[PDB]
Amino acid sequence: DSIQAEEWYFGKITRRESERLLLNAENPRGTFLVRESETVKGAYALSVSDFDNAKGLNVKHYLIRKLDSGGFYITSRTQFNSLQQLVAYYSKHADGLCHRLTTVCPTS
C-alpha cells in the first residue's frame, strides 16, 4: 500500500549504492529499484540494469517527477496515480526506457 512496503522500493540509497546492487552480473537485463532522488528534492529515481552495445553492463537512472496535486511521471505525457502503477506499466513494456522492468533488485 505505502511505497515503503514494496520490495523494489529502497528509499534513501545513493546513486552509487544503487549501481553496486544493479551491476551484479547475475541480474537479468531490466533489473530495477526505485529510490529517492539525490538531485531533485521530493522526486524519485528508477534505476535499471542494462546491457549497452558499447559499454556492456550499465545502469540507467530515470527521474520520476512528483506532482503536488497527486501523481508521478518520467514524462508528463504518461502519468500515474502511484509509483506502484508506474512500476507496473514500465514492467509491461519499455515505452521509451532502455528496457522494460523485469526483476526486482535482489536485496542489500
Curated annotation (Swiss-Prot):
<comment type="function">
    <text>Non-receptor protein tyrosine kinase which is activated following engagement of many different classes of cellular receptors including immune response receptors, integrins and other adhesion receptors, receptor protein tyrosine kinases, G protein-coupled receptors as well as cytokine receptors. Participates in signaling pathways that control a diverse spectrum of biological activities including gene transcription, immune response, cell adhesion, cell cycle progression, apoptosis, migration, and transformation.</text>
</comment>
<comment type="subunit">
    <text>(Microbial infection) Interacts with HEV ORF3 protein; via the SH3 domain.</text>
</comment>
<protein>
    <recommendedName>
        <fullName>Proto-oncogene tyrosine-protein kinase Src</fullName>
    </recommendedName>
</protein>
<feature type="modified residue" description="Phosphotyrosine">
    <location>
        <position position="44"/>
    </location>
</feature>
<feature type="domain" description="SH2">
    <location>
        <begin position="8"/>
        <end position="105"/>
    </location>
</feature>
<comment type="similarity">
    <text>Belongs to the protein kinase superfamily. Tyr protein kinase family. SRC subfamily.</text>
</comment>
<comment type="subunit">
    <text>Part of a complex comprised of PTPRA, BCAR1, BCAR3 (via SH2 domain) and SRC; the formation of the complex is dependent on integrin mediated-tyrosine phosphorylation of PTPRA. Interacts with DDEF1/ASAP1; via the SH3 domain. Interacts with CCPG1. Identified in a complex containing FGFR4, NCAM1, CDH2, PLCG1, FRS2, SRC, SHC1, GAP43 and CTTN. Interacts with ERBB2, STAT1 and PNN. Interacts with DDR1, DDR2 and DAB2. Interacts with CDCP1, TGFB1I1 and TOM1L2. Interacts with the cytoplasmic domain of MUC1, phosphorylates it and increases binding of MUC1 with beta-catenin.</text>
</comment>
